[PDB]
Design a protein around this ligand. Structure first.
Ligand SMILES: CC(=O)N[C@@H]1[C@@H](O)[C@H](O)[C@@H](CO)O[C@H]1O
Ligand SMILES: CC(=O)N[C@@H]1[C@@H](O)[C@H](O)[C@@H](CO)O[C@H]1O
Ligand SMILES: [Ca+2]
Ligand SMILES: [Ca+2]
Ligand code: NA
Ligand code: NA
Ligand code: NA
Lengths: 209, 201
């Protein structure tokens, strides 16, 4: 029933990133839609990183299988699964486009309908989460250029929040994750600050007095 | 081999297969297994070849049937449609496929170039091509689907890329808006000379 709240002081910036183990040189699972949507969740977690507003990167170090990713040293970029999750807030009403470009090796994106909220004294609690059906799935052909640029545009309402999940896999060597936002003005952004949020948990016993 | 000298068995247009779908089933339209493979188990209602203009937008408040792809009395109100073919252009460059405002749902698959067995009477696509990308769009129950979903890729002149589009109408309006943008920037509704089949020999 409520798609917004007066008190949203518990909203904080950024995607939450989870990095999972992935077998080096596996060019099969990157094309497997079940693996990209759910199967990856069974792998060992390597890192958890919050506060991420600039999600894109293009990393290749011929001399190291690790690199600094999202401010964290020694991340195993060479072979990994990355999951990014959060709530996208539309500022103004209009068509917003999410674009995945030249991905190496593969990525799948999920974008949900507007979340409802429970409104509490100390903040808002989003009720909807885990959209399960993907919109976009892009895969680099083995050993050839990824010329694919794939996008999803939809109308968003000013002030409303939409859950989003992006899954990215690097099987070996270069990790290229190019993820861009086009807002209704036509501006193209690689920085999601003031558009991407988490909602802090609160004590549901004291939601109201 | 990604091409052959003799391709005299190639003909134009998508091949359409229309399958039975239960009216008012708003569950399977959002089931990715159903949209990718499950539909293939349903009863076939129509087979239509030579489909050149694949898009349509049909709603008759007084009838559950309509003319689709020149065929009278197609059960548009509740159906699965599968379009398949091989995409080819003779001009290398960026091509975009776009699905818009789909009612009720659609899933699109685009494969890498197919290899061939070249024979005296024609070419045989080996058609085990790994997927390049896929798109999935679903209309929400309470509103027009605002989604416009597209894929652009650089395609090579003379290469054949398998393409498959699955569309479902669960009830009422069947909106399947599917367009091609070619390297010149022109936006086309007609796919005739961009989509091919290979005849059995
Ligand atoms: C240095 C480089 O570009 N390596 C890419 C690699 O990232 C990709 O995972 C692999 C399989 O497509 O193909 C290689 O050419
Ligand atoms: C006339 C019309 O647009 N009817 C639509 C129908 O096509 C759609 O399948 C259904 C479920 O989303 O919602 C109805 O409002
Ligand atoms: Ca790679
Ligand atoms: Ca419908
Ligand atoms: Na490139
Ligand atoms: Na009528
Ligand atoms: Na046309």
């Amino acid at each position: 029933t409520a798609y917004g709240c007066d008190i949203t002081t518990n909203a904080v910036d950024g995607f939450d990133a989870t990095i999972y183990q992935y077998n080096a040189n596996d060019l099969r699972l990157i094309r497997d839609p079940t693996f990209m949507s759910t199967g990856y969740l069974g792998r060992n977690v390597l890192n958890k990183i919050s506060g991420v507003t600039v999600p894109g990167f293009n990393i290749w170090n011929p001399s190291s299988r690790t690199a600094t990713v999202y401010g964290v040293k020694n991340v195993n970029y060479y072979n990994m699964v990355l999951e990014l999750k959060g709530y996208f807030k539309a500022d103004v009403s209009g068509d917003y486009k999410l674009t995945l470009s030249h991905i190496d090796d593969s990525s799948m994106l999920f974008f949900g309908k507007e979340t409802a909220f429970k409104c509490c004294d100390a903040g808002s609690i989003p009720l909807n989460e885990a959209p399960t059906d993907y919109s976009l799935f892009t895969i680099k052909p083995s050993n050839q250029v990824n010329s694919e640029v794939i996008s999803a545009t939809q109308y968003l309402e000013a002030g409303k929040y939409y859950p989003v999940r992006i899954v990215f896999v690097n099987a070996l060597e270069r990790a290229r994750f190019d993820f861009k936002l086009t807002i209704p003005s036509g501006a193209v952004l690689d920085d999601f600050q003031n558009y991407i949020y988490q909602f802090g948990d609160l004590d549901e016993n004291s939601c109201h007095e």
